[PDB]
Amino acid sequence: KVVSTDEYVSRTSIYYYAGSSRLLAVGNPYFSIKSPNNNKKVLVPKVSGLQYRVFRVRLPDPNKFGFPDTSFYNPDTQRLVWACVGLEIGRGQPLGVGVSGHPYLNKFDDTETSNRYPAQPGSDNRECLSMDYKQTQLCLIGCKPPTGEHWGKGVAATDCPPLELFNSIIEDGDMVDTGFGCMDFGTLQANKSDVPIDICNSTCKYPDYLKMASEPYGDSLFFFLRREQMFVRHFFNRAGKLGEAVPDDLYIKGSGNTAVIQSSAFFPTPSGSIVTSESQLFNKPYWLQRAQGHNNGICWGNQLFVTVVDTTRSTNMTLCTEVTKEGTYKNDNFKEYVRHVEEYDLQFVFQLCKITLTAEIMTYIHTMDSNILEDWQFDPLNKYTFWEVNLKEKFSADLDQFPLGRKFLLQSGL
Amino acid sequence: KVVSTDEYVSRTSIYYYAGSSRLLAVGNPYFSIKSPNNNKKVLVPKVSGLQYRVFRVRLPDPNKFGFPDTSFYNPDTQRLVWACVGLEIGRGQPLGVGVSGHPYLNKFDDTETSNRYPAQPGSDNRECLSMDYKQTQLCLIGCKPPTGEHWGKGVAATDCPPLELFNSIIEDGDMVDTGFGCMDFGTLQANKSDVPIDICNSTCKYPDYLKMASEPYGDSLFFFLRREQMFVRHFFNRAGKLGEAVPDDLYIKGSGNTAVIQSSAFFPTPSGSIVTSESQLFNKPYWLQRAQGHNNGICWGNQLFVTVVDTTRSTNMTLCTEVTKEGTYKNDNFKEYVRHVEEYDLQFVFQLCKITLTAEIMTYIHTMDSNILEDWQFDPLNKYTFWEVNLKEKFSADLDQFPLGRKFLLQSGL
Amino acid sequence: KVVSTDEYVSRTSIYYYAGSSRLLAVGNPYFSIKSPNNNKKVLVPKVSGLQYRVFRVRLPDPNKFGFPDTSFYNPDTQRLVWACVGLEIGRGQPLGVGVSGHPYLNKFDDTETSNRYPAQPGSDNRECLSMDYKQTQLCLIGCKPPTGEHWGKGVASATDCPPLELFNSIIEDGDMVDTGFGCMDFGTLQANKSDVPIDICNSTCKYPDYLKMASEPYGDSLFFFLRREQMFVRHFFNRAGKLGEAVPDDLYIKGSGNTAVIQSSAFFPTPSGSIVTSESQLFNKPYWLQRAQGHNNGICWGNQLFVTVVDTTRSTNMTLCTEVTKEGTYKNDNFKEYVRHVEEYDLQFVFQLCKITLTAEIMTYIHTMDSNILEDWQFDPLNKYTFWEVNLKEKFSADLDQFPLGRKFLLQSGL
Amino acid sequence: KVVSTDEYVSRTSIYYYAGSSRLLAVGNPYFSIKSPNNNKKVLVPKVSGLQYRVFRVRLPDPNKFGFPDTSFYNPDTQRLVWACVGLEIGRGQPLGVGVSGHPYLNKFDDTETSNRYPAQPGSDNRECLSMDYKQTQLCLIGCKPPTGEHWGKGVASNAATDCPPLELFNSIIEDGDMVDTGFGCMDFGTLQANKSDVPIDICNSTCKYPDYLKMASEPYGDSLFFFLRREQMFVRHFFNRAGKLGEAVPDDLYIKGSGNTAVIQSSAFFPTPSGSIVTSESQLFNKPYWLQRAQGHNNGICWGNQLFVTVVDTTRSTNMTLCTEVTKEGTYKNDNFKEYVRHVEEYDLQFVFQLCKITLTAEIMTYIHTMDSNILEDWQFDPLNKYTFWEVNLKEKFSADLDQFPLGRKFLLQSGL
């Protein structure tokens, strides 16, 4: 049914470089700040190292592109399309680790060494704690937005909410899993206090690698890299009513001080250990020679999708303003703010391709995607939020005038 | 006596892909919840990352399979059987570490730095503690269920129970070793308080690699991988009567505060350190080219057994329901639950094989297993618990339409 | 427009070694000590392992150099220039890690395990704490001073949070490298002078703008570079003072009683940089500049060179103690405590002599690239910056086998 | 000027093995013990894993050696000299880490997490602490004693500091000198007058670090025929010093406090190092080194019929605890026992030498004379005694039967003979 793109897409000797300039995002790493009384316009966006970066790269239409010589193909029976052969995801900020927390984190006791009896929380025993998240690096490249998975509230001896595994398109700004799982914390944790504030009212998504790899045409994952790591830093338990009590066959009942059983609703705090330059996935070129899927880097629709997660540059800068100048230090004389920045530099090398439009090939392309033939003269993604990267006026045939272009000339022997 | 399967099983050029869709398991990581009152129906199963996953894959009978052309073998003197040549164990959920504990853990004093004399009074000094288990990855593939070992109570100046090393069939759901050894904690630890609740009334089994490797025909281990790691996090001692006192020649008797000797029954807490993508054993293809045993991947009985242990995705999700909504936080207004999930996607590539049934080969096969000849027209495993994976209607000759199939075509050069 | 130097610069078989003597820097790792008078003359300089070392190496003019035989080129139509083909940055002193701190560090509570309610802050809750910084090794070699980036207070436009602007600047000798708190201007963005230790609290931390220096057309900044950074979070603290941006109400349920007053969610972590090893050392080993990724393949225009070095793996701070009053018993007031830091460098170079035929086309290319190249050849603005001047005009020798890096080059090239 | 020894030293096919027996050093790891007839005679020496081991290996004169056949060279116009081609530094005892401390360590507060105001008064707030030092492995081989560097008290100009002037000193590393421990290579006896800023085994000693740059840049290359090194350490804890802060923090770096924070605390921080972990995989010893081609001009030629092997190995620094019973009683009493600390070191040096001959032409005689006149004078054609070395006399340890020894068999397999 499905065939490789190498069987009906003819490669040419024409190569072009396309590089977006430096992309910056500066905001509050924990929450967005909206402008009153607008209650809809955001003045300071939420920019965190635990966010997905979904770049929608817009490519110019090669069939309407101003080539200096068009004698390499026949516009009467052939159409053109771009193919991605070189890619480098540039990262500018220094290596570092940021922290996230909650002023009312639902932590009762440290259950690691000493947690004797008796013990029973009051009505409000939340604490102001912080932690460092699981370290995650990943990059996905394709002509279709990636598909992610997360657990949500689904649809009786227990009052535990039913869990359902949901698939969704990963949009720019979505939170990645931090060590507490890939779930909808806003709907599955009603107290808003079990995880830090930057995810407590958000949904953490993990890329559904199995689904995106098992799709027939392979438009989602041309190529991908991933490096995750975490360990358990501390051991705590939850405050509140234990919904599922420990059955009687797992322990001998106590008495006296041990008469009232303590909450066995444990939860750990993660830590993505150390970050190193040696483990970096970025600032290095990737050559997309042969993809594992059937689509070998063909950018249908003249568009591209680059998904990036990089927690190795999650440093949160502390800013402090002086409200009142005095000869001695007073806490009420200063205001503290927290800001986070992200610096990207996407570099691409594209290969021009031609497709002879036979009746058989037109049938295959129509069954694959009718919009491909319609646009060739022979939209639903706007409801999602992406980082638009317009490279329509960024294409250049002079490869040796750019870093990735020179690297491509050395790699291919040109 | 025993000969390699390569000497009497003829390989063909026919290959088939078989793919197990997405498999999900959701439950309580510490204990199962049954129906009140039924004591036989289970509403919430026990699903933990420390459990064995024993998949019993059912293969279609090749002698009754609808092949498009059967001119490659002679059904009068030859029989068909499947051989496993390609395998990929798909893993979905993100990497993470979960914790387990006991609200009445038999911990007395922290014996790491400071434990002065005299010793804490009382009859019940158990504490509510938690820990992270030893990290264990392993996968076993074979046509016979795996054999595991565990220490249990045997029959016989100590009242210590006699220890006996037991072999048993590893069933789906059996607990793997967690750092406290592979033993029957339910029978050898009567107080139900020496290990956390998810193993305190269960049996931890470790694969008897030596027995399965030394078996004559080699039906258990076509291929296997393993990666274990742990270290000692904390040092504690047990409360209660020390059954075996330290002899007098190992210490000088004390006086005053040190008049009554403390319990020297020490025990450590493990810690499966850190998880990384670089150390993953799964989500990568295994090519069964030449097995170390005499069975070179022949799936006798048209069945298969895939055993998997993966604690690198043992994250326990915290769920929280709001029973009463109020303007201020109160602990009694919420219920806390703990859930764990597992996502698998088994992918197989099989090679069709033929066996010419000569008098010598029929005698050899009968001495190996009479049921092979009886079923060929020329049951006792139902008492055990396995995860049935029915692939009778999942075979396809179009390898390039699936991920593992494309990987297999690149590997073999076809 | 721009072409590689291999197309218009001809390589010769003449090689020269250049070796700097022993380079030492001794001072206070936290701050410089000036003279009671002028307040501008420095008695004790600031020498810290977290500082950039930007060596401006002066090379002798090859067009005015005394060669024993000048029959290899024609001065009427050709000019000479040096090309760097071998380099080894020698580093002295043992491996070690130093620490920096603040006697009035703005730390309130330890937010890692236990920070229960309620919280009653004061007016001055600063503490005397210390830490060890992020570990950073790097070396940049080029004929142009390096370009670094840092965040400073810009102008723009609401909330009273200061606007952030990304600034580029020339990395000068003595500038502070990022320590785990980011590359920012702490003097202007942290007014209380107490959020980071004293050695950076009134300074600017700069990070090399690798992207800008790599994307420049001629590639004069980065002939070659190495880098190794590492750090992890050691402790978790929170800030004292008014929280400028309060946590929105949709992220938590309000408390009551002891939990009525919310605690400060202005967290900040402490870096560490784990461990240093000899196996991870970037220095004391030769680098051979065979083919650069940029268009400039190691040509040292202007007869000068720039070597940028950061090495926190030798940041040990020596403790000195003087006895003011000698007594039979120990008294704290009888001694004075000092802190000193040292740095030992030994730069070694191997240069290859090159010739350039000055045709009308090549003269136009060089003029559009840099007119000062043609002007000096007979055919300054960097003085406002601070560099470590390394004068090698009288250090060139054609006898390569008489020096360590020269011998290593002779084995490498097969000469 | 300088030429390689391969250009004027002719190699022969004669090889000899020389192996020293088991070398042991047992003593107190923290300080030396004198005795009666004191301050001159030492009963218990200072033996610590943080010490340099500088072996001065004495070789027999090949020109006076009893060879079975002397027809391979002409004694009228040629002279003989040994060349080191094989070496194995054997190390005994198990791997382990020892600790050092000070009963009056100048520690004030733990400045890692909590150090609130105000600060404890006190005239003597020293504490009895210990630590594990930076891990260091190294071995240097040459025909000249090694040159080390250390910071000492210099000479100033008697402008507004009382800080002692620092001077970088070079010196010959003697057997028993202390290696750097993570506090730097300095003279703690002269630069730290209170004798309480570093543990007792270095507080009155000088820590030396090998001046690799000086020994590598020397013309003839007699110091470093070959060398290995592996150092590692990290910061375990954070403390600050007690006493008057000599250099106060300038006013532009902080806002002054008031009340509890009125008196500023000492910002004289110091960390404690910790040479992390030891492994067999990271061992430099118990393995053969083949000195085929040195980076210097001297290709392993043992001028003067002597050799220098410098070794530092902190991977076997375990300090054994000994306990004697002075009074036997039925119950434990602290005053009934005496506690001692001892440290041991076990070495086994193995060598494979190649016999060499040098034809003494007028040009070669001039080159050798300008290099070292004593070479020609001894050939018939002292100042190192003021230093302390571990003499390894191999004059009666040479054997021509290589296959009768471990390193000899390893050398025969390596060279294909």
mmCIF file of C-alpha atoms in Angstrom, chain B residues 146-292:
data_model
loop_
_atom_site.group_PDB
_atom_site.id
_atom_site.type_symbol
_atom_site.label_atom_id
_atom_site.label_comp_id
_atom_site.label_asym_id
_atom_site.label_seq_id
_atom_site.Cartn_x
_atom_site.Cartn_y
_atom_site.Cartn_z
ATOM 1 C CA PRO B 146 10.823 -19.032 32.564
ATOM 2 C CA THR B 147 12.000 -20.736 35.745
ATOM 3 C CA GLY B 148 12.619 -18.549 38.782
ATOM 4 C CA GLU B 149 14.160 -19.203 42.197
ATOM 5 C CA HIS B 150 13.175 -17.979 45.652
ATOM 6 C CA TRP B 151 13.900 -18.963 49.247
ATOM 7 C CA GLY B 152 11.031 -20.394 51.276
ATOM 8 C CA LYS B 153 10.340 -22.131 54.564
ATOM 9 C CA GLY B 154 11.722 -25.675 54.506
ATOM 10 C CA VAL B 155 11.232 -28.687 56.765
ATOM 11 C CA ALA B 156 13.652 -29.707 59.518
ATOM 12 C CA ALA B 157 20.330 -24.276 68.790
ATOM 13 C CA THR B 158 18.271 -21.782 66.794
ATOM 14 C CA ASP B 159 14.541 -21.387 66.227
ATOM 15 C CA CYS B 160 15.341 -19.903 62.815
ATOM 16 C CA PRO B 161 13.107 -21.392 60.095
ATOM 17 C CA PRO B 162 14.895 -23.762 57.710
ATOM 18 C CA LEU B 163 15.625 -22.233 54.316
ATOM 19 C CA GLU B 164 14.993 -24.119 51.077
ATOM 20 C CA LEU B 165 15.719 -22.926 47.545
ATOM 21 C CA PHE B 166 12.564 -23.380 45.456
ATOM 22 C CA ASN B 167 12.170 -23.344 41.683
ATOM 23 C CA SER B 168 8.868 -22.272 40.148
ATOM 24 C CA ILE B 169 7.332 -20.986 36.928
ATOM 25 C CA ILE B 170 7.454 -17.187 36.830
ATOM 26 C CA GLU B 171 3.870 -16.027 36.294
ATOM 27 C CA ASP B 172 2.676 -12.612 35.177
ATOM 28 C CA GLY B 173 2.450 -10.431 38.280
ATOM 29 C CA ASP B 174 5.107 -12.142 40.397
ATOM 30 C CA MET B 175 7.359 -9.723 42.256
ATOM 31 C CA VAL B 176 10.981 -9.245 41.238
ATOM 32 C CA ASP B 177 13.764 -8.897 43.794
ATOM 33 C CA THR B 178 13.830 -5.414 45.307
ATOM 34 C CA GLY B 179 17.101 -5.392 47.275
ATOM 35 C CA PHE B 180 15.860 -7.473 50.220
ATOM 36 C CA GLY B 181 16.522 -10.746 48.374
ATOM 37 C CA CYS B 182 14.364 -13.223 46.471
ATOM 38 C CA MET B 183 12.330 -14.886 49.210
ATOM 39 C CA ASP B 184 8.785 -15.586 50.376
ATOM 40 C CA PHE B 185 8.323 -12.690 52.790
ATOM 41 C CA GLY B 186 4.825 -13.893 53.676
ATOM 42 C CA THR B 187 6.109 -17.145 55.187
ATOM 43 C CA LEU B 188 9.628 -16.199 56.348
ATOM 44 C CA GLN B 189 8.747 -12.806 57.926
ATOM 45 C CA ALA B 190 5.739 -13.404 60.173
ATOM 46 C CA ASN B 191 5.399 -9.870 61.578
ATOM 47 C CA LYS B 192 4.373 -8.437 58.159
ATOM 48 C CA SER B 193 6.436 -5.332 58.966
ATOM 49 C CA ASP B 194 10.046 -5.964 57.861
ATOM 50 C CA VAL B 195 9.596 -4.996 54.185
ATOM 51 C CA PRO B 196 7.203 -2.590 52.425
ATOM 52 C CA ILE B 197 3.630 -3.640 51.783
ATOM 53 C CA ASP B 198 3.989 -4.518 48.090
ATOM 54 C CA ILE B 199 6.274 -7.493 48.871
ATOM 55 C CA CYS B 200 5.590 -8.166 52.552
ATOM 56 C CA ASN B 201 2.844 -10.680 51.664
ATOM 57 C CA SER B 202 4.244 -11.687 48.259
ATOM 58 C CA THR B 203 7.077 -13.817 46.873
ATOM 59 C CA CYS B 204 10.023 -12.209 45.088
ATOM 60 C CA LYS B 205 11.494 -14.416 42.358
ATOM 61 C CA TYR B 206 14.842 -14.193 40.582
ATOM 62 C CA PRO B 207 15.424 -15.944 37.236
ATOM 63 C CA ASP B 208 17.403 -19.167 37.650
ATOM 64 C CA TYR B 209 19.734 -18.340 34.772
ATOM 65 C CA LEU B 210 21.988 -21.310 35.553
ATOM 66 C CA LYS B 211 19.170 -23.875 35.409
ATOM 67 C CA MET B 212 17.649 -22.428 32.227
ATOM 68 C CA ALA B 213 21.077 -22.266 30.572
ATOM 69 C CA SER B 214 22.033 -25.837 31.527
ATOM 70 C CA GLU B 215 18.791 -27.442 30.353
ATOM 71 C CA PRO B 216 19.471 -29.813 27.429
ATOM 72 C CA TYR B 217 17.186 -28.588 24.652
ATOM 73 C CA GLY B 218 17.428 -24.877 25.465
ATOM 74 C CA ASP B 219 13.709 -24.119 25.112
ATOM 75 C CA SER B 220 13.684 -21.486 27.884
ATOM 76 C CA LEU B 221 16.342 -18.958 26.803
ATOM 77 C CA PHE B 222 16.558 -18.164 23.108
ATOM 78 C CA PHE B 223 18.081 -14.822 24.148
ATOM 79 C CA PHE B 224 18.103 -12.577 27.195
ATOM 80 C CA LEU B 225 19.326 -9.209 28.452
ATOM 81 C CA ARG B 226 19.721 -7.932 32.000
ATOM 82 C CA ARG B 227 20.947 -4.792 33.750
ATOM 83 C CA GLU B 228 20.714 -4.514 37.541
ATOM 84 C CA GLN B 229 22.082 -1.824 39.839
ATOM 85 C CA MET B 230 21.592 -0.738 43.450
ATOM 86 C CA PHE B 231 23.409 0.743 46.421
ATOM 87 C CA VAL B 232 22.804 1.116 50.152
ATOM 88 C CA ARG B 233 20.918 4.313 50.988
ATOM 89 C CA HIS B 234 20.436 3.996 54.768
ATOM 90 C CA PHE B 235 21.316 1.649 57.632
ATOM 91 C CA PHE B 236 18.716 0.515 60.175
ATOM 92 C CA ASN B 237 18.204 -2.286 62.692
ATOM 93 C CA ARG B 238 15.217 -4.449 63.585
ATOM 94 C CA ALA B 239 13.064 -4.235 66.697
ATOM 95 C CA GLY B 240 12.167 -7.355 68.654
ATOM 96 C CA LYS B 241 14.001 -10.227 70.284
ATOM 97 C CA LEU B 242 17.380 -10.968 68.716
ATOM 98 C CA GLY B 243 17.110 -14.680 67.997
ATOM 99 C CA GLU B 244 20.856 -15.349 67.714
ATOM 100 C CA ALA B 245 22.880 -13.448 70.304
ATOM 101 C CA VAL B 246 26.430 -12.333 69.544
ATOM 102 C CA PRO B 247 28.904 -14.736 71.209
ATOM 103 C CA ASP B 248 30.881 -13.390 74.145
ATOM 104 C CA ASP B 249 34.239 -13.562 72.327
ATOM 105 C CA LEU B 250 33.275 -10.775 69.883
ATOM 106 C CA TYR B 251 32.869 -7.873 72.335
ATOM 107 C CA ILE B 252 33.659 -6.687 75.846
ATOM 108 C CA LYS B 253 30.591 -6.546 78.074
ATOM 109 C CA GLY B 254 29.356 -3.103 79.070
ATOM 110 C CA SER B 255 28.054 -1.496 82.239
ATOM 111 C CA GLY B 256 25.781 1.332 83.299
ATOM 112 C CA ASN B 257 24.123 2.853 80.242
ATOM 113 C CA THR B 258 25.658 0.108 78.074
ATOM 114 C CA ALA B 259 24.540 -2.732 80.367
ATOM 115 C CA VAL B 260 21.787 -3.999 78.034
ATOM 116 C CA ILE B 261 23.110 -4.817 74.564
ATOM 117 C CA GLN B 262 21.171 -3.508 71.563
ATOM 118 C CA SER B 263 19.928 -5.576 68.635
ATOM 119 C CA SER B 264 22.584 -6.282 65.994
ATOM 120 C CA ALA B 265 19.973 -7.343 63.396
ATOM 121 C CA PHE B 266 20.925 -4.756 60.795
ATOM 122 C CA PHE B 267 19.282 -4.269 57.403
ATOM 123 C CA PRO B 268 19.980 -1.753 54.607
ATOM 124 C CA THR B 269 17.662 0.207 52.307
ATOM 125 C CA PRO B 270 18.407 -0.073 48.563
ATOM 126 C CA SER B 271 18.291 2.631 45.878
ATOM 127 C CA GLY B 272 18.201 1.945 42.136
ATOM 128 C CA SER B 273 20.309 5.126 41.694
ATOM 129 C CA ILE B 274 19.475 6.890 38.418
ATOM 130 C CA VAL B 275 17.651 6.039 35.192
ATOM 131 C CA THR B 276 18.897 7.154 31.779
ATOM 132 C CA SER B 277 17.898 6.717 28.160
ATOM 133 C CA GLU B 278 21.452 5.553 27.417
ATOM 134 C CA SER B 279 21.006 2.489 29.659
ATOM 135 C CA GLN B 280 17.668 1.412 28.169
ATOM 136 C CA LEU B 281 17.385 -2.190 26.993
ATOM 137 C CA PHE B 282 14.036 -1.774 25.203
ATOM 138 C CA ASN B 283 12.639 0.132 22.208
ATOM 139 C CA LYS B 284 15.459 -1.378 20.125
ATOM 140 C CA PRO B 285 15.427 -4.428 17.837
ATOM 141 C CA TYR B 286 17.031 -7.736 18.790
ATOM 142 C CA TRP B 287 18.159 -10.069 15.997
ATOM 143 C CA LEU B 288 18.030 -13.746 17.005
ATOM 144 C CA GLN B 289 20.735 -14.984 14.649
ATOM 145 C CA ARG B 290 22.410 -17.780 16.646
ATOM 146 C CA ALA B 291 21.335 -18.824 20.131
ATOM 147 C CA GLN B 292 23.796 -20.220 22.656
#
